Design an enzyme around this catalytic site. Sequence first.
Site, PDB file in Angstrom:
ATOM      1  N   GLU A 166      11.029   4.521   4.131  1.00 60.20           N
ATOM      2  CA  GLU A 166      11.396   3.015   3.616  1.00 60.20           C
ATOM      3  C   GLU A 166      10.574   2.370   2.592  1.00 60.20           C
ATOM      4  O   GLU A 166      10.821   1.499   1.716  1.00 60.20           O
ATOM      5  CB  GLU A 166      11.383   2.465   5.018  1.00 60.20           C
ATOM      6  CG  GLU A 166      11.660   2.988   6.206  1.00 60.20           C
ATOM      7  CD  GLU A 166      12.185   2.271   7.274  1.00 60.20           C
ATOM      8  OE1 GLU A 166      11.712   1.471   7.347  1.00 60.20           O
ATOM      9  OE2 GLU A 166      12.650   2.865   8.398  1.00 60.20           O
ATOM     10  N   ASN A 199     -13.163   0.456  -7.263  1.00 61.14           N
ATOM     11  CA  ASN A 199     -14.973  -0.173  -6.042  1.00 61.14           C
ATOM     12  C   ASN A 199     -15.418  -1.815  -6.534  1.00 61.14           C
ATOM     13  O   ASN A 199     -15.776  -2.100  -5.433  1.00 61.14           O
ATOM     14  CB  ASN A 199     -16.122   0.694  -6.119  1.00 61.14           C
ATOM     15  CG  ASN A 199     -15.258   1.886  -5.234  1.00 61.14           C
ATOM     16  OD1 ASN A 199     -14.174   1.951  -4.303  1.00 61.14           O
ATOM     17  ND2 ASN A 199     -16.541   3.388  -5.319  1.00 61.14           N
TER      18      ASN A 199
END
Lengths: 427, 35, 49, 433, 432, 298
Positions: free
Chosen positions: D246, D198
């Site tokens: 992929e 964060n």
Amino acid sequence: MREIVHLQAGQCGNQIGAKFWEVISDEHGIDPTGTYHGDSDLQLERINVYYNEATGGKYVPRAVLVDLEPGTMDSVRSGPFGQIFRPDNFVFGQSGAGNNWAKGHYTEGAELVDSVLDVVRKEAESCDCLQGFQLTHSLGGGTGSGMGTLLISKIREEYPDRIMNTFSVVPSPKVSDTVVEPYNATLSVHQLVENTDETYCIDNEALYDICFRTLKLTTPTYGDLNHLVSATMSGVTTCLRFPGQLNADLRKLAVNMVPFPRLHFFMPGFAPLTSRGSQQYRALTVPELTQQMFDAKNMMAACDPRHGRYLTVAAVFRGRMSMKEVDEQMLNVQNKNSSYFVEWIPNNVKTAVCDIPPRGLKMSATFIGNSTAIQELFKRISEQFTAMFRRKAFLHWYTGEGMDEMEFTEAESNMNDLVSEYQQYQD
Amino acid sequence: KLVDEKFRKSLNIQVMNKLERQAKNQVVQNENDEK
Amino acid sequence: CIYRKEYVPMPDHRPDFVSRWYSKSKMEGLPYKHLITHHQEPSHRYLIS
Amino acid sequence: MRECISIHVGQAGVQIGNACWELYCLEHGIQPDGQMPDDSFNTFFSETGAGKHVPRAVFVDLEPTVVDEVRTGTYRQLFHPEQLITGKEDAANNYARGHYTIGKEIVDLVLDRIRKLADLCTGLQGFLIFHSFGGGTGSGFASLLMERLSVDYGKKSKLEFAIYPAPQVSTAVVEPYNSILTTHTTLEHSDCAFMVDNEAIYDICRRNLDIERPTYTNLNRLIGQIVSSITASLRFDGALNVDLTEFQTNLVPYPRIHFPLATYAPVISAEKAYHEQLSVAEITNACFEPANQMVKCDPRHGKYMACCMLYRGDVVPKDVNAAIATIKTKRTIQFVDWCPTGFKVGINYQPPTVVPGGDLAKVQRAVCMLSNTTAIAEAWARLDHKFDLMYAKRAFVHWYVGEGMEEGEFSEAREDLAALEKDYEEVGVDSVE
Amino acid sequence: MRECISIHVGQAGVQIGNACWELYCLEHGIQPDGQMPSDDSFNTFFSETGAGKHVPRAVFVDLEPTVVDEVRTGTYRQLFHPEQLITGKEDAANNYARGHYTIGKEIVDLVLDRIRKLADLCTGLQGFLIFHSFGGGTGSGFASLLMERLSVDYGKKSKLEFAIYPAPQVSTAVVEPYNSILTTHTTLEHSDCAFMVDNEAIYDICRRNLDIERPTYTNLNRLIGQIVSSITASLRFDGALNVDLTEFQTNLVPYPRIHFPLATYAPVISAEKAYHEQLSVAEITNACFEPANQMVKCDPRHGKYMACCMLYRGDVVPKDVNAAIATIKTKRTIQFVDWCPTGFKVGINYQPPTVVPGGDLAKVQRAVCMLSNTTAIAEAWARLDHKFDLMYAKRAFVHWYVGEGMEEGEFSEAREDLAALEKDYEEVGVDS
Amino acid sequence: QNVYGPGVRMGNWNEDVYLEEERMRHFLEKREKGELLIQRNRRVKKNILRPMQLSVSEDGYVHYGDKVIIVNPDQVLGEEAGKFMRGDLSLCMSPDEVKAQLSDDLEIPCGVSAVQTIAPMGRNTFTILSDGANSCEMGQVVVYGQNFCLGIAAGLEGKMLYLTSDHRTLLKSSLKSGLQEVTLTDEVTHLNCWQAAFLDPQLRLEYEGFPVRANEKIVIYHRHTNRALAVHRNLFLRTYFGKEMEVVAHTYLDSHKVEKPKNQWMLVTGNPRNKSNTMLDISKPITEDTRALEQAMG
Ligand SMILES: Nc1nc2c(ncn2[C@@H]2O[C@H](COP(=O)(O)OP(=O)(O)OP(=O)(O)O)[C@@H](O)[C@H]2O)c(=O)[nH]1
Ligand SMILES: Nc1nc2c(ncn2[C@@H]2O[C@H](COP(=O)(O)OP(=O)(O)OP(=O)(O)O)[C@@H](O)[C@H]2O)c(=O)[nH]1
Ligand SMILES: Nc1nc2c(ncn2[C@@H]2O[C@H](COP(=O)(O)OP(=O)(O)O)[C@@H](O)[C@H]2O)c(=O)[nH]1
Ligand SMILES: [Mg+2]
Ligand SMILES: [Mg+2]
């Protein structure tokens, strides 16, 4: 008579084929509906060569379109010419290959080839005297590199006699969009050499050169790159389809082109390419065409021929011309660049003529070359494959499909045994 | 005996698996058509 | 309430539909006539044996 | 057809779910009541008889309050009340509570709900699980659910979007313990990760976006942009569409090393972007500057192993190729010896649709990078450091012991990550003599 | 033409008769007066008069007047003819013996006379529907008497039987194992099917699926009417595969002593739960196989199916019926006995089920009903035997029944007749 | 690095300006000739949307030769579930616009659909013609049980497209529903005939062979198939004009064996006062109500 079944696999093959089936649709004067709207009789005398007769004066392709991932086939069906390909000629699975050669060639390639073997067999007996088979795919993907070559292994067992031509798309090193490409390339080149009569090594880097410098196109997209392959497509069979002073076909060039069966890797080109600025102040004559073939710049392979010796060279001229200049120019270019031809074959240049020029043009030519410098591409796949095989990197995507490692070893062995005997012929 | 009885049932599942695949392929074809 | 104030309903926004059209045609590119047609020859200009 | 299922756990899971699903609805044009007034429309929002649509997500939490906020919120009428799941008592920053005693009461209900949602789908593509390592529920319950989900569906892809504790700031003390404890599950039962801290988003928002007092909501909108731009290849039609399979294939070279870094460009406000012309080279090098990482680690301290590269918008393959060439002719960007080729190019056309009232300006072309690199390893080294200096006096162990999990498994996980960092160093080793 | 007559017995029968007959009026379009509004599927239930009003072919019977008098004052007071609703001055009061030997014969002749008149009106009578409870005295005693005497007047005629089995945990009575054990003999030799349902199972269904945290008997009454509508629906309305009452008996009862199927209804979901869910025929058959949605407190994952009746209804395509039944067969925790390789029967109806106002089920395009005969229902009888012998050992409550005039030997015999019935249900469980 | 706009005269500006001239010249030639897609579509859609005036029912009856409009009313469809479009629907001819851009020729066969619009115009106006085989002269009164046909002129002058349907085969069916499909063809056959039936099944034989009123609910029955004209208010079709309904030929019945509200049909005649308007949009008299106070007195 002499009919071609056009195979079509992969995303690339599906697109250039739709591009290829746009030019021969334009020239033969058939509208996107399916009806003939040309003017002359000669345009419909031999249309059995690519088109199949169907009721109502409508013609349909002898084309088989295959793709593991159904995403691309909606685009082909939704182009300008998307109302011409038969839906039963569309055969698709639900899952792609994820750019894995092993998956498309072993695991999910098994369930689809029975469908593809069926429809080509339907088109095998549909015409009477087939001339051969012709395929487009990419060795850098997962389906065309994969299941595309599986059909080649199968159809060569079914029909040994027919010539097989492959316009395959060879990956470029300087511009690469896939890291498992040197795997799939190594595992498809091995499959090409034993079962293929003649391979047209096409790449994408040199095509990106040509538009930028020879055509001065500021935004050359994939569409214009697909234009040039489709141009070379028709130029190979421009003699089989039409009359001329010296006719030819696929077999006449191929026997004139392959002295030993291991050497069938070619280097295609297209002649009338100039800028959009120079549409008026540029003469469309025989000698300036010949001056355009034998530069290294117009070339759509990824090698400079000046580093090797041209074994054999074929020039297929299109349109009407007097003949004497060609033999003068083809002989002339042989004499001046005598050091760039192998001595052990005389009269290296092959010439064929059709009389009809293509649409929107007066004269055209296509140059197909077997040269030493095509070896420069094959060594450097191994320059990448060794770097990835030595660390066993990315390997487990392949061993999860049931294959062994020895196939990787023997694939490198066969390409190594290709260039080693290819190098002896240069020296 | 018991081993043979298990394989007597693993042959059956493939039949309905094929039926399901065939129906799904047809629905896929129609959803491609309209699009 | 933080969450309510942020996710107020706020109509009047409709998603674009034509930028994809523009990009499709950009990827298509120039047609045959602006690709290779020379001296603006018509269809029947050279069709004699 | 292609379909994703989202598995959001915890307060973080449900709030990134709020932001992401809101962006999805607004892009596709879904009204907040669940109705409509060129692809997808089946991967995320399956459609019922009355033209209504229902998202393919499950939000799970062991405390009611934050999900009750959605149940009373703006989209109360869009989400099926069966999908949102709650419990009375939470885990209270304890993996032991989140995994052994209170997780069991609910894991059957959650698995039944996801089994139903799977039976809705025809061809499921995979699972995206959103959580934090620092929360008790989002650690323990997610670990259990992944453990049982892997054996329920052997082949389905499982991606992780996790909030890794930041190197300096955090909101918990036993957070290193929970982070340590989640890693065995996320190692042996996962395929790819997107651990993001964060603090990095705090800095990048204070730097490019000129908001000096941001919100967790401003964080959430950016993470929603990340996931939407990732799934955009399946959501729309494209020249180079990429699938989750992929980019798993070009993100995992070895099965135990599945930890990329995510990065996004361009991140810029309206006034800032009113002037600077945005192009392919600019966005592709802004995605390479270490100031834009969402993970607090410097890639100049590591070597890139693989790069997955997703463009979106008015992008041309010529300039993608040129951008790749320009970034390849650089020494400051290093590569591992065994990877001569290094990029996946995927392309989508839909320009990024802006959430009004947010922070990002309307941008015509965007790019995301998923970089497998070895510079993430030092973050785990620091986690190992703090874990050791809190485990040495057996601090905080009595909570776990009294809940009912054994102490030596802590040392097991320590040894696990020691081995993991050893594999990362081994991969970084190059065979040049 | 086809006709069905209801022999609803007891406060359970009368309060069921309210809920079921409310639905029959709304589906055919009958006003509560009886006349259709100014602006012939109905013939199987109603009957034309000269006045063109449609009098129901039902006979409510009870041994106390309070339950029936509410019908006499309710909304449908002008629909039911006065002679059909039979009352009495004193009831059995939770006693099989009172309702079978001392109070039953007082009103045996009056109802057996009335039932003949409703049978007279019907030319081709399809069958007898009997609704009662094993719990109450009139629901057990009197219901046992008329079934015995119905058999001697119409030998061929089917007697479909729907009752309320004692719930395994909740109980509204104490001596009800005596009522539950002793009545089953008549249900064994003088019933052709069964539809036993437990209120506790339905209590689970309503709170879990309909979100109603505080149900009442009506919520339990409404779902029962939806069951009886769907089984008869193939008689009332046209379909692709019409199935009669005689048809499904054949494909559900392989042995004369095995006639205890199980009922299940799906989908039963509220409007807010019919809000956000697509309802496909696959989504409503997998729900009909889960034990949590079943209506008896028994699990066929503890037993084996021997027959199943699928009753489809609504916008259904026979293609996708075949797809659903195929997927069910590809599942190992759904078992079948070795002598049932094909264990389905499918009926198809066109008209979607109607929606009553004030109910809980939203209006839905399609539905499924199921009558599944499994041997996992035998375990329900075991607990009743287990409870019966804990209480017959010390001869509790026995003095009531003898003082009502029945011999103690039947306590032995009725205990034993179930013992043979449980053993018979284990022979089917064996695989050769 | 500093890519510039059109007129900045930069870099590869010369070739781009040449190409701009080329494309501009090509567009100019097509504009002058009249082959532009904008021009062609504008002309054909104008010839479609041309407005007209309807006939006037003098005796409250319909006659052969009268211009009319086919409209199904919006009955109170409390039974309809899912999504159903309300309002009064009008049967109108629907072409395939894709084939319109491919070829400028008229499209045979041409579809029929329903659009929630009761404005008379070139798309939805039907002349009532004779049977061809039977000599029903123009101006004669249409009768129950008597065959009649409806025709719409479109495109080239003199077109007389008739609506027809035929017994269903595997090779012809409705696009989505799969039931018997109805379409417009130019040829004249016995399949072109249509009959009208009175609403109530009970007194249909009594009202057989009686004059037919206008703007009143009736049932339409194709002669050869005996099927009825029905509209699926649930199935939709997106076209250039907008969201249009699906229409088929299949009779529909309730549990009481009466035609369901999708088989109801109303003819439409023109408003005598205002010609652009129809009878269904005529105004109502404005007066006040006395029933409230009247019943208050009692
Ligand atoms: N980026 C981001 N992080 C969040 C958000 N919400 C919670 N977190 C992180 O989650 C951490 C705490 O975990 P929680 O989700 O609050 O707690 P939990 O997962 O429900 O587990 P318990 O505390 O036992 O209930 C905090 O330190 C935050 O860093 C969010 O909306 N955005
Ligand atoms: N499910 C359901 N059960 C009911 C209903 N009405 C009564 N019962 C059952 O009836 C049982 C008590 O017997 P009753 O039917 O009330 O009385 P009876 O059958 O006339 O017999 P007596 O009490 O001796 O007069 C209770 O255990 C209830 O479970 C109802 O409407 N629905
Ligand atoms: N020449 C050319 N190449 C293309 C085109 N479209 C995609 N490609 C190339 O194809 C490669 C990916 O192929 P892929 O779709 O994965 O092949 P498949 O797995 O067999 O379907 C990329 O490297 C692209 O450069 C095209 O239109 N022309
Ligand atoms: Mg929490
Ligand atoms: Mg009672």
